[PDB]
């Protein structure tokens, strides 16, 4: 969703404390104004990406204190109060799995991980309690079995299936979430896309740093 | 009422566009980015790039070609780097604009030329129509969307148990105001008496949890008696 | 430009009227307070003592 | 600005010139790391934590449904290059 | 940013709704989608 919200200035990177290098870079014109503007645009674009993705919800919603969802377990996806940061166990392992001072400064994301988790929790609570309605206006509470029956009705399977098989579908969804838990915890190549993005950004920054060690 | 709401909505769009300078923010940002790129490209003509002067005519009148060619080569390398940077920025920005143009074409295709069921694709709400409006170097859509306003909290059940056979709502939601159970379409409170027309029987009562005893009206007996 | 951050913003944007927002006008660099030079003990100490 | 003028510290950095506010307001000028600054009342710049929105506790229940009784045909202006 | 537009569309059509676009949200008839914040990205649990 958002790459590393980085920002790099020439005046420190290309030239250190030296001023002669700054003077010679000055005669090159506004390349570095362009570069700083482009990187600032990228950073603002990252913040806009995060807001466009997560902030579809206008009012932060709170999950009900009692999780009487007709059998479904969301403890893996709902925030865990026990941990100091209100991130879900799945979110916790996702953060666990994913794993330079020369003018290269990493601008902090405007939305911190706690508020991004708050957006995610609001979206989860809206999906669980209201469904699709919270994204199309007011949030309208609806029991989770009812909205799941409506999702079946959406995919052309009548509401018969769920209400007749509420416990079975509940257990299937629960074991599916548990298998997501296990396959994420055990297999390290699950978060391939995010790990590749982080590795690409880190190696790009590392290459940029090592370029200072090149004679040219 | 709906015609009046639509007209007032259009009028409020007109007033908001007139009052708010940043209403056309996306288009103004595109124009400003292009103008800034062009202005920077023009300004690079004023940069020395290490040459003695940034105007070709002066160095061409000041230096004979043997040693003039090195300064002209400095300027050529600098201006070619600037132009390559400008063209690359324009290519990436034009890829962004082409993504925006394919998005606009798709929005026109199933919002102006159709009704899109993709949620939040064309306006926040259940999208109804879209009216294109040509704007300088862009397009503007008036995504007429249906947004419900006044919700009323009700007591619901997944099913209705009549004669021991579960009745599910054919299309809508089972709701009640207290001692009176009604079936209602999902997005607008229109209570209707429960009937076999809008309820389809499905299985036995005990299978589903949350079922409530009730009565379902069937139209045949009033004709049978008469 | 150097009078106040607002004038630095005007100089950066090259516009007298600047719209509300945040603008990276400059970079804060802490200058070295003094210079320290450290070198090992004089191994080939001339036997003046 | 000279140091000591309503200095406030956050993860983004040392914010000087705006006094911190415990109340949460909608973001106007994003400082970074969750801090947003606005010009509010005699008048001074206030740096505050982001208000993601009004915390709405949806009255969920296993038998609670909300059905709207009225709508708003709202024309939303989407501007696309 | 193309991926972020894709993710925003995915929440808009699957977290905020139900999408009938085949194979858009998980292999199969899509039912729901649960966002899960992940470092510099998002993770969808496409219930299909
Ligand atoms: C539904 O909402 C509309 C407007 O959103 C209401 O229409 C208003 O009605 C009052 C009194 O009847 C008028 O004073 C307003 O001028 C009307 N507004 C508009 C925009 O027409 C309507 O009353 C609400 N209720 C119902 C049942 O339609
Ligand atoms: C559902 O979540 C876990 C996952 O299996 C389960 O063990 C727990 O008992 C359930 N939660 C509640 C509140 O019943
Ligand atoms: C929402 O539902 C609850 C049910 O406990 C009810 O008490 C409340 O009045 C409802 N809200 C409104 C605005 O009627
Ligand atoms: C509920 O709806 C019925 C339908 O006629 C009506 O008679 C009744 O007054 C309404 N209110 C209550 C509290 O039953
Ligand atoms: C709803 O939940 C309450 C407790 O939360 C329980 O007493 C009641 O039997 C449940 N009813 C249905 C229809 O699920
Ligand atoms: C419906 O009526 C039957 C008649 O015996 C009863 O056993 C059952 O509990 C009733 N259902 C509810 C939800 O009260
Ligand atoms: C005096 O003699 C000592 C011998 O213990 C020597 O270390 C020292 O350097 C001498 N002083 C001078 C000034 O040479
Ligand atoms: C905010 O709350 C803290 C709590 O200790 C307090 O120290 C501080 O003075 C408060 N700030 C304002 C502006 O009220």
UniProtKB/Swiss-Prot annotation, chain D:
Main component of the anti-COVID vaccine Chadox1/AZD1222/AstraZeneca; in which the human tPA leader sequence is added in N-terminus to enhance protein secretion. Changing residue 41 to A: Partial loss of O-glycosylation by host GALNT1. Disulfide bonds join 27-36. Glycans are attached at residues 22, 41, 62, 70. It is found in: Virion membrane; Host endoplasmic reticulum-Golgi intermediate compartment membrane; Host cell membrane. The cytoplasmic Cys-rich domain is palmitoylated. Palmitoylated spike proteins drive the formation of localized ordered cholesterol and sphingo-lipid-rich lipid nanodomains in the early Golgi, where viral budding occurs. Specific enzymatic cleavages in vivo yield mature proteins. The precursor is processed into S1 and S2 by host furin or unknown proteases to yield the mature S1 and S2 proteins. Processing between S2 and S2' occurs either by host CTSL in endosomes, or by host TMPRSS2 at the cell surface. Both cleavages are necessary for the protein to be fusion competent. Cell surface activation allows the virus to enter the cell despite inhibition of the endosomal pathway by hydroxychloroquine. The polybasic furin cleavage site is absent in SARS-CoV S. Changing residue 69 to I: In strain: Alpha/B.1.1.7. Belongs to the betacoronaviruses spike protein family. Variant D614G has become the most prevalent circulating sequence in the global pandemic since April 2020. The mutation is associated with higher viral loads produced in cell culture and animal models. It would not change pathogenicity nor neutralization properties vs vaccination. May be prevalent because the mutation increases virus transmission in human population. This is Spike glycoprotein. The gene is S. The chain holds residues 636 to 728 of 1273 of the full protein.
């Amino acid at each position: 969703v958002s790459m590393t919200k980085t920002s790099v200035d020439c005046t420190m990177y290309i030239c250190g404390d030296s001023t002669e290098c700054s003077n010679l870079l000055l005669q090159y014109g506004s390349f570095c104004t362009q570069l700083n503007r482009a990187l600032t645009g990228i950073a603002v674009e990252q913040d806009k990406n995060t807001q466009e993705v997560f902030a579809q919800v206008k009012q932060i919603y709170k999950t009900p204190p009692i999780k009487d969802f007709g059998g479904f377990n969301f403890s893996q996806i709902l925030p865990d109060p026990s941990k100091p940061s209100k991130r879900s166990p799945i979110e916790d392992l996702l953060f666990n799995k994913v794993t330079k001072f020369n003018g290269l400064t990493v601008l902090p994301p405007l939305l911190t991980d706690e508020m991004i988790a708050q957006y995610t929790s609001a979206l989860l609570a809206g999906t669980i309690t209201s469904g699709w309605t919270f994204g199309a206006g007011p949030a309208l509470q609806i029991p989770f079995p009812m909205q799941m029956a409506y999702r079946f009705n959406g995919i052309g399977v009548t509401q018969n299936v769920l209400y007749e098989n509420q416990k079975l579908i509940a257990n299937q969804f629960n074991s599916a979430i548990g298998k997501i838990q296990d396959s994420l915890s055990s297999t390290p190549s699950a978060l391939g896309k995010l790990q590749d993005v982080v590795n690409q950004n880190a190696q790009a920054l590392n290459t940029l740093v090592k370029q200072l060690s090149s004679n040219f | 009422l709906i015609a009046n709401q639509f007209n007032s909505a259009i009028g409020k769009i007109q007033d908001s566009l007139s009052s708010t300078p940043s209403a056309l923010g996306k288009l103004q940002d595109v124009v400003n980015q292009n103008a800034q790129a062009l202005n920077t490209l023009v300004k690079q003509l004023s940069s020395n790039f290490g040459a003695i002067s940034s105007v070709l005519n002066d160095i061409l009148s000041r230096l004979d070609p043997p040693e003039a060619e090195v300064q002209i080569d400095r300027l050529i390398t600098g201006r070619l780097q600037s132009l390559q940077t400008y063209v690359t920025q324009q290519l990436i920005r034009a890829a962004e604009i082409r993504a925006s143009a394919n998005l606009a074409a798709t929005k026109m295709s199933e919002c102006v030329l159709g009704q899109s069921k993709r949620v939040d694709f064309c306006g926040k709400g259940y999208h109804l129509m879209s009216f294109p409006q040509s704007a300088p170097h862009g397009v503007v859509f008036l995504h007429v969307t249906y947004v419900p306003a006044q919700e009323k909290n009700f007591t619901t059940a997944p099913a209705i148990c009549h004669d021991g056979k579960a009745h599910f709502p054919r299309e809508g939601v089972f709701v009640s105001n207290g001692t009176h159970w009604f079936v209602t379409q999902r997005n607008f409170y229109e209570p209707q008496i429960i009937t076999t027309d809008n309820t389809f029987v499905s299985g036995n009562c005990d299978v589903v949890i949350g079922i409530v005893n009730n009565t379902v009206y069937d139209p045949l007996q009033p004709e049978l008696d008469s | 430009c150097a009078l106040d951050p607002l004038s630095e913003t005007k100089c950066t944007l090259k516009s007298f009227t600047v719209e509300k927002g945040i603008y990276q006008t400059s970079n804060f660099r802490v200058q070295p307070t003094e210079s320290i030079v450290r070198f090992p003990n004089i191994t080939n100490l001339c036997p003046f003592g | 600005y000279s140091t000591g003028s309503n200095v406030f510290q956050t993860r983004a950095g040392c914010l000087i010139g705006a006094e911190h506010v415990n109340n949460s307001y909608e973001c106007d000028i994003p400082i970074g790391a969750g801090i947003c600054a606005s010009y509010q009342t005699s008048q001074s710049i206030i740096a505050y934590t982001m208000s993601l929105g009004a915390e709405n506790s949806v009255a969920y229940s296993n038998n609670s449904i909300a059905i709207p009784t009225n709508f708003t045909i709202s024309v939303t202006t989407e501007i696309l290059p």
